[PDB]
Design a protein around this ligand. Structure first.
Ligand SMILES: [Mn+2]
Ligand SMILES: [Mn+2]
Length: 269
């Protein structure tokens, strides 16, 4: 079977309890994870150890807090006490875990299921070929010996409009924002980097990225996490918002793909 789980945010106990609920069995089943495995919850270290141990039985995409962790590890960004990353950063296997993490994809595609996953979703300004090329470009810098330079460059809110003509730092910053930070779009598809509210509370003319018809969503289902204030609600057919705020005291949500059946684990806090 195929299971898709939203943002774990270091909630190791809830993750394992949820996988036991569905009797997840590596080798018979595959787990997809929307990213943001780390930060805020208490068990980022255990989560990373476990997900890395699954090997081919897990398909991960990187989220904005996974990239922040990599920036802290590389000395690019300052550690925030609220993220609770110190046990992972001080672990004896921190190098092994984080060098594995930076090699994971930004985008997962399964053609037989017609299923696409990314942390924040797929901007409607991208077709599938463009999404694949952009993911490959950022994955290449992250898996290279020079990834701290990219992590430093990635921070920024502009440009917010895609063009095939974008080059250099602006192109990478847009790609990173589209995959890992996106929520709202202007009607023409441009990213808004400021509003984090629910769709009902957002100022006009902002619309969720998934409310704007895009070429990927016309042909593929899209699963994503990231947008906790959405609470997993309000999406069109074929759009699966899996982040139900476990680390925030909400719940951890698991979707089984074959029958679209949901399983929920209450937050322990
Ligand atoms: Mn996120
Ligand atoms: Mn998150």
């Amino acid at each position: 079977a195929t299971y898709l789980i939203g943002d774990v945010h270091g909630c190791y106990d809830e993750l394992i309890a949820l996988l036991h609920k569905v009797e997840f069995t590596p080798g018979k089943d595959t787990l997809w994870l929307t990213g943001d495995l780390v930060a805020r919850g208490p068990g980022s270290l255990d989560v990373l150890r476990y997900v890395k141990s699954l090997g081919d039985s897990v398909r991960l995409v990187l989220g904005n807090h996974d990239l922040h962790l990599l920036a802290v590890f590389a000395g690019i960004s300052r550690n925030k006490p609220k993220d609770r990353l110190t046990p992972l950063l001080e672990a004896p296997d921190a190098d092994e875990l984080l060098n594995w993490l930076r090699r994971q994809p930004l985008l997962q595609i399964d053609e037989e299921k017609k299923l696409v996953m990314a942390h924040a979703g797929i901007t409607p300004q991208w077709d599938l070929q463009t999404a694949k090329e952009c993911a490959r470009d950022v994955e290449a810098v992250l898996s290279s010996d020079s990834y701290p330079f990219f992590l430093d460059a990635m921070y920024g809110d502009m440009p917010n409009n895609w063009s095939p003509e974008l080059r250099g730092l602006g192109r990478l910053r847009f790609i990173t924002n589209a995959f890992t930070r996106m929520r709202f779009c202007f009607p023409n598809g441009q990213l808004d980097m400021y509003s984090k509210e629910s769709p009902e509370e957002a100022p006009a003319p902002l619309k969720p990225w998934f409310a704007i018809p895009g070429p990927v969503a016309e042909e593929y289902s899209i699963a994503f996490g990231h947008w906790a204030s959405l609470e997993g609600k309000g999406t069109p057919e074929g759009i699966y918002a899996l982040d139900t705020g476990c680390c925030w005291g909400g719940t951890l949500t698991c979707l089984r793909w074959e029958d679209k059946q949901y399983f929920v684990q209450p937050s322990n806090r």
